[PDB]
Symmetry: D2
Subunit: 32 residues, 4 copies
């Protein structure tokens, strides 16, 4: 169960990296 809690933190960190990268992609497309 703690292994699950630690996995969730890990997954959340990965998702924040993805959000940052999608925002970068949306910027780049916006720049033309």
């Amino acid at each position: 169960m703690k292994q699950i809690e630690d996995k969730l933190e890990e997954i959340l960190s990965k998702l924040y990296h993805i959000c940052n990268e999608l925002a970068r992609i949306k910027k780049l497309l916006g720049e033309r």
Copy 2:
């Protein structure tokens, strides 16, 4: 057409933020085990 992609990325980012909040909420409930 590129504006439609941009707008969809914006929508996908908001959905992903919602998912992150829900998974954070789960994590808190597991720390209350």
Copy 3:
């Protein structure tokens, strides 16, 4: 706890929608 299991199924379904849409976006960009 079952509420958590049901939330995870819900989140997974949403993520599969997102994957499908990103693939559509990658197609569209590829088409020029």
Copy 4:
């Protein structure tokens, strides 16, 4: 430049599939409660 975006979307999709498998693995472990 557009090929770099496409390649990054491909990388992000593979990361999201990995996340989906990990969350499915959690879900199974919660059904074994």
